[PDB]
Protein backbone atom coordinates (compact mmCIF):
# COMPACT_ATOMS: atom_id res chain seq x y z
CA UNK A 1 0.00 0.00 0.00
CA UNK A 2 2.82 2.44 0.74
CA UNK A 3 4.45 1.68 -2.62
CA UNK A 4 1.16 2.07 -4.49
CA UNK A 5 0.37 5.30 -2.64
CA UNK A 6 3.74 6.85 -3.45
CA UNK A 7 3.30 5.85 -7.10
CA UNK A 8 -0.34 6.99 -7.51
CA UNK A 9 -0.18 10.80 -7.94
CA UNK A 10 2.38 10.66 -10.75
CA UNK A 11 0.30 8.12 -12.66
CA UNK A 12 -2.81 10.23 -12.18
CA UNK A 13 -1.17 13.43 -13.48
CA UNK A 14 0.19 11.50 -16.46
CA UNK A 15 -3.26 10.07 -17.21
CA UNK A 16 -4.93 13.49 -17.14
CA UNK A 17 -2.41 14.90 -19.60
CA UNK A 18 -2.75 11.83 -21.83
CA UNK A 19 -6.54 11.99 -21.90
CA UNK A 20 -6.47 15.69 -22.75
CA UNK A 21 -3.92 15.09 -25.50
CA UNK A 22 -5.65 12.19 -27.23
CA UNK A 23 -9.10 13.75 -26.90
CA UNK A 24 -7.65 16.85 -28.55
CA UNK A 25 -6.88 14.56 -31.50
CA UNK A 26 -9.32 12.40 -33.44
CA UNK A 27 -7.58 9.10 -32.70
CA UNK A 28 -7.26 7.41 -29.31
CA UNK A 29 -3.83 6.21 -28.18
CA UNK A 30 -3.15 3.01 -26.25
CA UNK A 31 0.62 2.31 -26.21
CA UNK A 32 4.06 3.80 -26.75
CA UNK A 33 4.37 2.28 -30.22
CA UNK A 34 0.91 3.64 -31.02
CA UNK A 35 2.02 7.15 -30.08
CA UNK A 36 5.07 6.79 -32.32
CA UNK A 37 3.03 5.72 -35.34
CA UNK A 38 0.75 8.69 -34.71
CA UNK A 39 3.87 10.88 -34.80
CA UNK A 40 4.63 9.54 -38.27
CA UNK A 41 1.12 10.20 -39.58
CA UNK A 42 1.38 13.73 -38.20
CA UNK A 43 4.62 14.27 -40.15
CA UNK A 44 2.99 13.11 -43.37
CA UNK A 45 0.14 15.58 -42.94
CA UNK A 46 2.68 18.34 -42.30
CA UNK A 47 4.53 17.65 -45.52
CA UNK A 48 1.34 17.49 -47.60
CA UNK A 49 -0.28 20.65 -46.23
CA UNK A 50 2.99 22.53 -46.72
Amino acid sequence: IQSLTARAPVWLAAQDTLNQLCEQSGETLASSNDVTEYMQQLLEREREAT
Binding site: A13, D16, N19, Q20
Partner: protein, 50 residues
Amino acid sequence: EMENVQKKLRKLERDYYQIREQVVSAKAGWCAVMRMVKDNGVERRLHRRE
Protein backbone atom coordinates in the same frame (compact mmCIF):
# COMPACT_ATOMS: atom_id res chain seq x y z
CA GLU B 1 -15.43 -1.35 36.20
CA MET B 2 -17.66 -2.79 33.42
CA GLU B 3 -20.66 -0.52 34.32
CA ASN B 4 -18.36 2.49 33.74
CA VAL B 5 -17.49 0.96 30.33
CA GLN B 6 -21.32 0.72 29.72
CA LYS B 7 -21.60 4.31 30.62
CA LYS B 8 -18.62 4.87 28.31
CA LEU B 9 -20.68 3.08 25.66
CA ARG B 10 -23.49 5.58 26.18
CA LYS B 11 -21.19 8.54 25.82
CA LEU B 12 -19.69 7.01 22.67
CA GLU B 13 -23.20 6.40 21.33
CA ARG B 14 -24.13 10.07 21.59
CA ASP B 15 -20.82 10.97 19.92
CA TYR B 16 -21.73 8.60 17.07
CA TYR B 17 -25.15 10.27 16.88
CA GLN B 18 -23.51 13.68 16.41
CA ILE B 19 -21.19 12.36 13.68
CA ARG B 20 -24.17 10.79 11.90
CA GLU B 21 -26.07 14.07 11.69
CA GLN B 22 -22.93 15.70 10.30
CA VAL B 23 -22.71 13.11 7.52
CA VAL B 24 -26.32 13.24 6.37
CA SER B 25 -26.48 17.04 6.42
CA ALA B 26 -23.28 17.23 4.36
CA LYS B 27 -24.63 14.91 1.66
CA ALA B 28 -27.75 17.03 1.32
CA GLY B 29 -25.53 19.85 -0.01
CA TRP B 30 -23.25 17.63 -2.06
CA CYS B 31 -26.40 16.73 -3.99
CA ALA B 32 -27.09 20.30 -5.05
CA VAL B 33 -23.52 21.14 -5.99
CA MET B 34 -23.13 18.07 -8.17
CA ARG B 35 -26.46 18.92 -9.79
CA MET B 36 -25.30 22.38 -10.85
CA VAL B 37 -21.73 21.36 -11.72
CA LYS B 38 -22.92 19.19 -14.63
CA ASP B 39 -22.52 22.21 -16.92
CA ASN B 40 -19.29 20.50 -18.11
CA GLY B 41 -17.13 21.87 -15.30
CA VAL B 42 -16.95 18.61 -13.34
CA GLU B 43 -15.95 16.63 -16.42
CA ARG B 44 -12.28 17.54 -16.02
CA ARG B 45 -11.98 21.24 -15.14
CA LEU B 46 -13.02 21.31 -11.48
CA HIS B 47 -12.37 17.61 -10.73
CA ARG B 48 -8.57 17.91 -10.49
CA ARG B 49 -8.24 14.36 -9.22
CA GLU B 50 -4.48 14.77 -8.80
